[PDB]
Amino acid sequence: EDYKIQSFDLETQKLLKTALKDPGSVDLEKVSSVIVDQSLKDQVFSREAGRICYTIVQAEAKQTNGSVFRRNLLNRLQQEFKAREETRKRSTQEWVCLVSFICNIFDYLKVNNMPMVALVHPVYDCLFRLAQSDALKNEEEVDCLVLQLHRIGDQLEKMNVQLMDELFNLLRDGFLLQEDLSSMGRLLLLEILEFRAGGWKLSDTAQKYYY
């Protein structure tokens, strides 16, 4: 029904909808390549693509009893991941979009209904980059950091606690240490430092303050 599908070309919107039910009748190499590319660009799509990507792998399991689409999608995405530091120079919009998209994937795309181990260290690599002294300045990127930790921190800690410990050791440093930290960037950090400390819940009293 609704996937916020409009963002795309009207004839691409024809390829995808039919790729939802029938992966055998569509070129899955296109479908994967199509998704990755615009999602980098359209930030709204950087949060709705997960839903779509999963349901496709579910179909190909059902129809071809196989995943080929998943290979193309992961290969396509690992490429863009490796080339991230170049994309961070090229754009912040494009950088934040990619991170947003990788997390969105990790969250919905599952292997026998379990999170893909393959993406743990990648995702943590992104979040560590966003937690750097340079990135904490830019309040496009701090926006991004905390939007992820709001919806996937829970499972990431569960996957690996030491990394999460290090990440939050950086944020604590980035709060005491940093001479210039964005005014409302300072706000969004303290909020998660609490969020996590309360076991990935925002307390009622904290909910009033920040909202």
Next chain:
Amino acid sequence: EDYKIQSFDLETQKLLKTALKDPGSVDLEKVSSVIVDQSLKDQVFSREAGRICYTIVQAEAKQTNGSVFRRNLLNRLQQEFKAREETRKRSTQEWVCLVSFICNIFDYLKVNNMPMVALVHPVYDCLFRLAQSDALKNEEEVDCLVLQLHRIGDQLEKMNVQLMDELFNLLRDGFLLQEDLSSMGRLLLLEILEFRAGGWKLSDTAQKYYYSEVTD
């Protein structure tokens, strides 16, 4: 069993020692004043002063069914409380020694096994004072602020949450907005913000950050 009596004059030591055994015989007004005197000067004592005050009321009510000592203590303490604003100006160490003593009374000195309601609002008055931008400048005050939120944080929040939320807003505001905070000042504040967020418990990751971290 350890009361930290050793700071006192030798003949005043006997006064306190025999007060724990026979409060009926000894002048309980002077016992109270001597306690308040020393705890305003000595912080190591102001913490253990709660212990001894309790045991005396414990002994007095069990011996003569009276509260004569407790009232002598509270009148004396309230006298000091009313005046704090003045005592603050005079000398910092005397003022934080006062807060320490108020809070350590609220901690140990109990009525029929329950915390004295009378001191709930007062204790919150000191904390709200310690939370002001003029007081968050001073790093010796912040020291005293968090020790109390450590020692009796949970208990107070249970007596009154509303006031605790209010107070933790001021702490958030000081962090977000206030300009001049000592380096520890900033470090001691985040800890306590996390302390409460965990439910007056310090998570393991936190422990290490604050207690094993090394700074050049």
Next chain:
Amino acid sequence: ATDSWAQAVDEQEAAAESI
């Protein structure tokens, strides 16, 4: 003995003395 702390405590005790 109007806003008296000592009074307020005495009254807390007695409030409990009645069971």
Next chain:
Amino acid sequence: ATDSWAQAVDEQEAAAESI
């Protein structure tokens, strides 16, 4: 793929399909 994620996911899947 030699070290490809898509390879590492296949193996996490195949692992789960073994009792």
